[PDB]
Structure formats: C-alpha cells, structure tokens
C-alpha cells in the first residue's frame, strides 16, 4: 500500500483506528492521516471508474443532524450508502424537540444500543462531548458550536495534498504557502485546517479587514506546531488586509464565508498569482467568489466538495470495518 | 421482447439511447422510449404480483429532493428505488427558500450531483427544475413542478389506459379511443400533460367543465396539431360539454380531476360545481360496458365511495401502476449496461 | 432443535399462523406466538451481541408512518428492519391533519399498501390505526396509538422480565412473580397493556399511586378475569398503596411510569435498600425525575437493557410476520 513514496500498513493502522470516535482533528495522528489520505484516493479512483464501492456492507448507522445542514448530512449518507451500509436519519429537528424532556446521556446510551455508529451535528459543544461519554458506539462529529469539524479539515487537507503532495514530506526545502481570506475571526474551518497544516512545512498569509483577524490562540497553536518540527521562522506567519499582497506566492488560496469588497475573488485579482495556485472555499459561497472564476482552472472548490464523499467513505471504512482492502 | 404482439422492442438498443437521460416533460419521451417503458412496466407488474426477485438495479444511490409535501409521488419513487435494490437519501418536508438558504440552485445541484448517480426532484417553481438540469452532472427525473410538467404521472396514466385499450398504440384509423376529461380542466395540469401524450395517437376528447374552468386554448391547439400530424383530426376530434349525461356517452375512459374548493370564490360556488360533476353509480349507467375511471388522486368528493365497488373504477390500480412505471423508468435510465438475460422478463 | 431451556418451539407451525398477521393489540399475540417471539428475540440478541450476520429478512420494503414525534420507537423499528437486511421509507415530521390533507385514512392506506410489504404505524388517534388495518392490503404493526395499544412495548417489557425471572412462563402455582407499578397508573397505558399480558401467568400486583392517578377499574377487572382463567386469582392477587416504602416490599420487578407534572414517588438508592436482592427496575422511558441518575449504577437498574431489548423484539416480530420462508434450517439458532 503506497501513495508514491510512503508505504502504509493499513492492517495495523485499522487495528488502531477500529471503533475510534473522531470529534476534533487532533484525534487524528500522522499515521491515521496517511491511512485516510491513501484510502480516500482508492475510493476516488474506484468511483470515478464506476467500480464496486461496497467495502463496508452489513453496518447500520444513525445520523443525527439537530440543525438544518443538508450538504454535510447528504455527504455522510451517500458515503454510507455507497459503502453498501444502511442509515437511519434524525433531521429537521433542533436540540429541544429531540431531547423533549430527556437528557443527552439517556438518549445516546439508548440510541447506541441500536446501531454500529453515530454521525452527530449539533450547534452545542457540550452535547457532542456528552454523547461521546454516554455512547457504547463510536461517534463522528459532523460539526458543532466549538468549531470542531474534523471531516471538513480532512477533506480540505486531502484536496491540497492532491495538487501539492510534498506537504506530507516534512522536507525543509519544500514549503507550502497558503493564504486564508475573509472572516478569519468566525471562520472555524480556517482554525481547524490551520492546526492540521501547521504539523507540516507550511507558511501562512492571513488576509482580513482588521475587525475579523485570526485569533491569537490559533497563531499560538500554529507557532507551537511549526516549532515542534523545526519549521518556525519570523516569515512563518504574515498578515495583510489586501488581495494584491496577500495572494502573491501562495500555492493555495482558501476563501471563507461571511454575512453583511477588499476580498472578492475575480479573474482580474488572480492574474498575478502563481500559475499552480488552487482556490478552495468550504462553501456555500455568497459574493466572495465571482461565477467567472468557476471557468478558471485554478478553481477547485467544487472538486473539494466532491472530495468530502471519498474522505467520509475512507474514515467510515477505517473505523467500522471488521476483518481485501480497496486498491486500484 | 414484444408488445401488443405486433411491435418488437430491442431493449439493449433503446437502453443505450435512454441511458443517463433526464426526464423533465412528457415530450422528452419518443414513440420507441414509450414502448420500452410500457413493456418494462408490465414485466415489473408481473414480477411483483408473483413475489419474484425485483432487484434489477442494485448498486445505485439516488437523492430524492421534495420541496413541497406530496407523499404518494415521493413514497412511490422511494419504493421503486428500494424494490429495484438501490439506495436513496431523502430531502423532505422542506421548501425552496429554506433548502436554498443563501445558495444558488446551480451551486446546490453541481455539488449534490457529485454525491449520487441520479436525482428525483419535486419543486413548485418551474425555473428551479430547469436550472437543476443545467447544473447537474447526473440525470434528473422531475417528480412535478409549477408548470404542470409531471412526466411519470402522464406515463402511469397512459400505462393504465393501454392496459384496458392496447389498440391506442396502433395508430389504426379504424380503432379510435374516446376519453372524457371531467372537472377543473383549467388547473388540472395532469389533463394538460396526458392530453399532449394521447394526441400522438388515434384519440377523440370530450372536455367536460362549467364555463370558468375550461381546457386552455394552448392545449387544444397542441392536441389539434398532433392529431392533424398523424391524419386523425376531424370536427369530431374535440367536443365540449357542461354536463355528465352527454359528456360521458361513448367514452372508453373517464378521467376525473381535483376540484379544490380554494379554486372558487366561496363554498356555494364550490358545492354547485361539486355536485354538478360528482361521479355516482347512477351517472355511470349509460356509459359503455368497457368504460374505465381514472383520477390522479387525491380523491375528495369528485367520486362517491359507492363507485369503488363498481368494476369500471381503476383509480387505485392507476396509483399502484406508478410503482411499476417508476421502476421501469429508473431501470432504463440508470442501468450501466444490458444483457438480454439481465432484463426483466416474466 | 428450537429450545428455550425446557420449552421446545415449533417455529414452522407458529410462523404459518403469524404470516401476514397484523399486530395492533397485545391480545393479537397468543401463548404459542409469545413463545415464538421470546425464542426469536433471544436468537437475535445473541447473534448481534456476538457480531454475527443478522440478515434473516432480506428483500422486503417497509413503510414506517409516524404521525407524532416518537423518536426512540421509530429509530428502533428502523434499526430492526435495516439489521434484518430489508429496506424502509419513512413518513415523519407529520401530524394526522397534514398527512390526511383532505384525504380519507382508507384511501391513504389502500394506496400506500400497494407500494410495500408492510407498514409500521404510530398515530395518537385510535380510529386511524383500526381504519388503516381495514383498508390495507398488507400487514400493519401498531407502534402506539391513543387507546394505549403498544404491543411491542408490552412484548419488550415481558422479554426483559422473562430474562431475569424465566419461571413467569411456567404457570406453576408455587412460583409467583410479584410486580409493583409506580406513578401515573391512570394515564400510564403501558401499565394497562403489560398488566393484561402478565395476568395470563402466575403474577401478583402492587399498584402504587397517590389517589387521583390510581389504576382504572377496567384493568383491575381484566387482571381478575385473566388470573381466574388459570386459577391464580386470590384476594391477595392485587394490592393498593399510596407510598413506596410499603409498595416496593417483596416485588421481583419495579416498573416506574412517566408522570409529566401537567415528588411522592422518586426512586433513589435510599428508597431501594429494603427491596429483594433480585429485584429489577424497568421504566418504558423517557424518565424525568421518577428515577435519580444515581440509580443507573445500581445493578437492580435494567431500564437501559429494557430499551436495548426493543431492537431484538422488533427484529423477532418482523421476521415472524414477514418471512417468505418455509424451512426449519433457515431460522436463527445461535
Ligand atoms: C458545513 C456544510 C456546508 C456542509 O453544511 C451544510 O451544507 N449545511 C449548511 S450550514 C449553512 C448555514 C448557513 C447560514 C447560517 C448558518 C448555517 C449552510 C448549509 C447548507 O447546506 N446550505 C444552505 C442552503 C443549501 C442547503 C443545501 C444545499 C444547497 C444549499
Ligand atoms: Na437510507
């Protein structure tokens, strides 16, 4: 099992990931990240070539979405169904109507008797952690109020690694430069992907309009990670409030969502970027990216969204399998 | 493969043509495609009535997106997918505005179509379905929109008729089908769609309505051009009546529409129109012996419960037929390939 | 071949009788059918706790119709169908009036039953379930209605009891089970249903309630006629208390009910110290105050196992009604 230059011992990494709960991106170590990246790639190729995808038959999951949150929920459903497993849904409900005079711990202790695993989206942070403590079965966090969204970070990382595979090498001569653009204060997807990218040889351009800057405790978490692998320097973190400077010499531009510009992306504002730059956005997009950019080959935000299917298939396969592997 | 015992269906070739086809309007189905649908529907009807293996399409994952409540069509599409042995994720009980929460229809469909092999979409907006089709990398079946496009209702309507009157397929100048459309012909879009499809054949039409709720001119024009084009138009081709006693005479089919009180000024107008067009065993005594009664449902008072025991009533068979017709259409579009041994064949 | 310790089960014969049966009330289950359910439930419990293949009912497509919020029962029936290897479409987020949008219950059920092999139906109206059964070409499982019929709640309650006290099946005049029902005995319909089923056996009852919320006479009468039928009725058979201290003495089972206060009877480790060693505590759930979280660590608490058992009991009932099967070798036998 190879992804160019690293052999992955998938048997051994699955033994370790079996019945693992995934709440935060920090619950995924280096070895587990390689296994996910590798397996995601196998599912991408199997599905793009119309091959049998049914690597996880015989499982029954529960999907609990207590805010309307249709793309992430459908992505998890499709992944389960394409793997050949089954799922029952709780949707179109909020906290109060689902927990109708019942504790979170009662609800999860009972629900986990019915199913092999639970996928849970709840805008409360407390609820996901209470569910994990109460559940006899593994939980995948599909997004909560603390800004934990592990599968968004994983699919973001998979997407980058697909155009810039050298991010995995921890090579002091091969650095990736990324610009994060928009609302860096409220854009939790930046916070989570930053922590994961900072384990690697990466330098960051934070591009925001003063009022919406990256929070200090993320800058600190980036600086501790980069220091730990001896890739911190005074040039590791740069701050801009304009595109013209922010977007210069970055392999990746990652746009965030807003609501109420310095930061609208046009073919014009992209003429002076590297020819290899790729554009991500977790979606949905509003004005941050003009429709004309969809025809620009630097745009990969729809491939990115597509990649969430393969990454969620991979993560469900590695946690829930009982045991050959997807290959080719 | 034979239909009517006259017309040979090369299902391999017709599948190659229908593969990854979107079905939005009944005019997206040609003569050959309609034969393959009718034939395949009949095989699913017999396999299921005999408790045989129905799993002729197993490895597919669909998304079903219903942005207005419409329980029977949605459940019928679910059942069809599941009976074929495929899988479906559902968006229900939601409207346009809450599902498109500050996202364009084009963004939503471009992404959703990466997840799945095909989409079933019901939206009361007509624009939305056409935008979905333009944005989607995967086929769409329109399960109903605001323009009155509802191709699987028309298809299951036609399947039902063809089961009692198979000669409608022959385009034989000696073998004419006579149908009465009864009730709200202005707002009954199922009449509009079925009319267009029937007018490809040797058919004459009785439009039975009171003044205010008559068939629109643009449908009469489309029926008249279709009948002319196959040299079946005469001054007899389209008649208009305001009462059952005349309207229901010498028709093979009576097709009753919904007369929703919210289409009148008040109750007195409703209950006058109601009552004038209500179907009883009495109002059916001077129809042909062979007359069959359709209604797209749901039923309110348009038809009295006593008529359910009358052998001329088939509106519950009609609704059941939607399962077989939706199984057929899904099989023909989404199969990756054929053998002659992979086809349903009772 | 099919044994339940010392009851031999003729599953072929009992399935011939249960095939395409509708189950609306606990009285639609006779002695033989109850043994088939108990036996099949036990096989599913062991297969699933040992991670074996559970797919004993492939190729069916069900419709599950929930016209009130009723999340646990609905998820339990979904899980059961999916674990058996069959498929389901769901109608939820609906009440009576919005689902029957100017359509009769009989029209809706006549049509829906053409699509599917079976229907699971929860509706707070009692009329609706009985009209559904009259109109349907396919079998219905009642998942709960307004008359307090909830057959799979009673069945999973009974399965739970029989697991700790298997002698309830023997109808042995020397082996009596003592149960206390605690809380709102007037509105607690699962007491009503389980009482009727327990009273087919050698059972005595402690009804513990204030005064305003006492067991209704019609249930006392139905318990007395059942117990008389097997000559287990005596003036000792039914006792009435207004306090836990007396009510809870010498009972093998304590069954706590929901009381939505729309204080006397909260269960604590303290109020449990002088119960039998062997007493088990049920509660149909959800619980609010009736049982303190401290009791969850008490080994007498089984209300979470009880709720888990609903999976195995719903798998069993679906298998026994819907199987297309003939042969003794196809049945689960851990
Ligand atoms: C994290 C991801 C993107 C996977 O989660 C979803 O997609 N769910 C969500 S949270 C959301 C939102 C918007 C405003 C305020 C608060 C939350 C957008 C949405 C969302 O789904 N599209 C909004 C409208 C829409 C729904 C589905 C498809 C297309 C458009
Ligand atoms: Na599903």
Residue numbers in the entry:
A (entry chain A): 39 to 298, 312 to 374, 379 to 383
B (entry chain B): 38 to 383
C (entry chain C): 38 to 299, 312 to 383
Question: Can you quote the paper on this entry?
Answer:
To characterize the mechanism of inhibition by BDAs, enzyme activity assays were performed using BDA-04 as an exemplar. This analysis indicates that BDA-04 acts as a noncompetitive inhibitor with CP and Asp. The structure demonstrated BDA-04 bound to the allosteric pocket shielded from the solvent by the 120 s loop and extending into the channel to the active site. The 5-phenylthiophene ring extends from the hydrophobic binding site to the “gate” of the pocket, blocking access to the allosteric pocket. The Boc moiety of BDA-04 partially occludes the CP binding domain. However, in the BDA-04:PfATC complex, Ser135 and Lys138 shift out of the CP binding site as the 120 s loop is blocked by BDA-04. BDA-04 therefore inhibits PfATCase allosterically, by stabilizing PfATC in inactive state that indirectly blocks the binding and recognition of CP.
Aspartate transcarbamoylase (ATC) catalyzes the second step of de novo pyrimidine synthesis, combining l-aspartate (l-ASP) and carbamoyl phosphate (CP) to form carbamoyl-aspartate (CP-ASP) and phosphate. Aspartate transcarbamoylase (ATC) has been suggested to be a promising target for antimalarial drug development. In depth structural analysis of the ATC catalytic cycle has been performed previously, which indicated that ATC exists in a low substrate affinity “T” state and a high substrate affinity “R” state. Here, we describe a series of small-molecule inhibitors of P. falciparum ATC with low nanomolar binding affinities that selectively bind to a previously unreported allosteric pocket, thereby inhibiting ATC activation.
